[PDB]
Amino acid sequence: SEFRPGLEGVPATLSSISFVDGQRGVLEYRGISIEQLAQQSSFLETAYLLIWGHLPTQQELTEFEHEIRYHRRIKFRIRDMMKCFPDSGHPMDALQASAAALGLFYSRPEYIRAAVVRLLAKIPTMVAAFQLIRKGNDPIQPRDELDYAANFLYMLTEREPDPVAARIFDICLTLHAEHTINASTFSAMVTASTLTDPYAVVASAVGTLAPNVDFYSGLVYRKLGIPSDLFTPVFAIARVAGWLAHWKEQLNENRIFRPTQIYTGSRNLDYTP
Amino acid sequence: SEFRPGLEGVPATLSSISFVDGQRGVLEYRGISIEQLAQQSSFLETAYLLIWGHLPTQQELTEFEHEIRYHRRIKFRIRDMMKCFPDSGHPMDALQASAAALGLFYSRPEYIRAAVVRLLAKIPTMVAAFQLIRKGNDPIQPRDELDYAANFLYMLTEREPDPVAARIFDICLTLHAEHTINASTFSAMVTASTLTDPYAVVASAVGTLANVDFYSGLVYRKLGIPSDLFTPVFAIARVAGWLAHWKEQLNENRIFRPTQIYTGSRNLDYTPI
Amino acid sequence: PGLEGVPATLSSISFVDGQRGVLEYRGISIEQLAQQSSFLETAYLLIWGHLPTQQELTEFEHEIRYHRRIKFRIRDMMKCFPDSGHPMDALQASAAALGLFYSRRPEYIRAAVVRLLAKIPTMVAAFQLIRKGNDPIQPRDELDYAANFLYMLTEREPDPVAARIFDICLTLHAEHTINASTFSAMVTASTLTDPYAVVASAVGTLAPNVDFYSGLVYRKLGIPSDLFTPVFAIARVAGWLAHWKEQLNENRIFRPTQIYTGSRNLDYTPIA
Amino acid sequence: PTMVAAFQLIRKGNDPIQPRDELDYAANFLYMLTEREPDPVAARIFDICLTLHAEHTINASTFSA
């Protein structure tokens, strides 16, 4: 008989998607070094690679980009629900409440193809709307003649940025979008095995997520004009690709997780009034 | 499966020696309560009870006491070797070393009756002797007139006491002679389990060993004994218990044998230096 | 009856699986560890838990080599024993009263292990010679562990090949899991003591399979026929010391309980 | 200097060291105290540092003799 405290060194599944070696430094998403990706690529490229399993042509990329550009705007009942929160909460409580209630509204082959589109589109709008409403003012609407990183930074600032900062923010979003098994990813994989929809899974993963890279991360963020409190929620968009990757293939093996225990306490007693 | 930390609450042995009960205040030395035994009895008359198992007559009592008093003496080889001991070490380590150096001189069906008279007559001489030899003197030698406790006090302080103090000390000794199973008695049991002599048993027990105290401290300080000597005294009495349990483990011969549960590494390679 | 199949601790040091034939010392099977490893390196493994660099092996070897000599009051206390007492009695007295001299009680975790590993074989070799009629022989300063021990015991320094046979037959024994000696070491050490006492009690209770290959390989090298069990203790102290350090972070205590079958409420008269 | 060195050792548990018969005054003393044989340069230096202390005129100790 053996034992394993805190569940260490134990295999849990058979991945394919990312590899790190750590003897010289080899970090690759699906089999490509990190610098070939970080010099001449854009975010939707990386995310199509991660999710779907290959690289796209010209047609399919232009179609994905237009579709994601059509679904960027929030409805009016949802703003009418946000208006009543207290103005003393946090951003992670706002994020769990909104991501959870967005599954009341639309839920029921396209099934796998649309949910990914809405989740990729509407998150940064919600983050920015509550940033404004927390202060007395109104929400700002989205433009239709901009691109992902610059559009988000405008909705937060109401000042239109020059292309250099847009490109820099975009690749700093490229180099965070994946890593291998840790707490949050095991929690998404535990939840998603009872055959559920992506809104509960992301609700639960963002429930448990709440020199090193941190030095320069802090500085290059502080200069672009982003408040302090909004540090960590900026993470959770960069990463929302990783988690969806997993939901797709853990839905293939139809098992359920359940270990057992080693009872260690007082035995056979009797009911004393 | 199951697991208990500290064997805490697992039955280990059978017994017929003592009984305790703590919701009402009951404590029995073979079924004769503590009050009517501390009212008109002495240490030797009890000790016969615990070890052998039934109240004695008068003829045997005379024989017993006469014999445990014609053997209080020692040779010059033990005293000559006692001198080569340091003079800045605790008296407890000297107790252990001397109890384990009795074994060389005396060793190898009246064999379980000689051992008791020897290990019961020959403790006080030696603890007092080291008390004197530590700070530069010569040790006293006992006369054939005084009693057990009277003679201990005379050897320790050189000036005779009055009889009332002797009587009080004899009570103080017949209180501390037994209780239920503890750490030290557990050590003596697991070491006797494989048929070895009584001396080794007493050395390992003393090694393990290093309300009522709140007043015993006072009663001892009054009579003129230092602080360094509060613990060896509490050992003199107690031997009369360890002995008894040795005597018991000899009827069944079955040797203690538990197991473990691992949680370490498995399969590795010796990497060259 | 007799504590069978009952889980007493959680440990990590040695693993043995019977029915399929295996044995490991911290995760490395034994037949791979015998052919390219010496003794002191194996003690270092079984104590701290990680094989060492080059400089650390060097400093351990030197530190051991400087602590083999033995002051003159200890010699002068050994001369009074009698010439008719067993050798295991000499070993209990010696290892128990070596704790009167050096007891301060990781500035006090790394000296004790050094002296305990240094000054045992000297004592067993001396009392051999003193019991016989003549006085002890000092240690050299140009040999290695098993060569030095064999020269102190017999005076005629051996061939290197015999040294190496001795050294691997000294690593074959250093470890094995729960038994009566080891359980008594832990029971003693649970109350937070220092080593010179737990070793005294553990050598108190020790007093074709491999009881046919030991006999002969021992009898050829030139070893008397009574020092058979004491030489075994030289091999085993390593094992025991690991335990005193593992069981010092749990802090609990031992206390099992008993059942009763005796008569109650009798009537007192001392004169029976 | 034999007496001074013998008590320096016995004060510590060990034994006294004996003298050699193939050395000179300052180096011999320094060996009996160290058990490590010294090179001639330090021997000569110690010797002349012993030369320049061996006399002075009337003070307490000399009046007492």
Residue numbers in the entry:
A (entry chain Q): 5 to 112, 118 to 219, 313 to 375
B (entry chain C): 5 to 112, 118 to 219, 314 to 376
C (entry chain D): 9 to 113, 118 to 219, 313 to 377
D (entry chain H): 133 to 197
From the primary publication:
Here we report the discovery of a natural protein, citrate synthase from the cyanobacterium Synechococcus elongatus, which self-assembles into Sierpiński triangles. Bacterial citrate synthase (CS) proteins are homo-oligomeric enzymes that can assemble into dimers and hexamers. Using cryo-electron microscopy, we reveal how the fractal assembles from a hexameric building block.
Indeed, an increase in the pH from 7.5 to 9 led to complete disassembly of the structure into hexamers. Instead, we solved this structure for a point mutant (H369R), which we generated in the course of a structure–function analysis (described further below). This protein also forms 18mers at levels that are indistinguishable from wild-type SeCS at 50 nM. Moreover, it is capable of forming the larger assemblies.
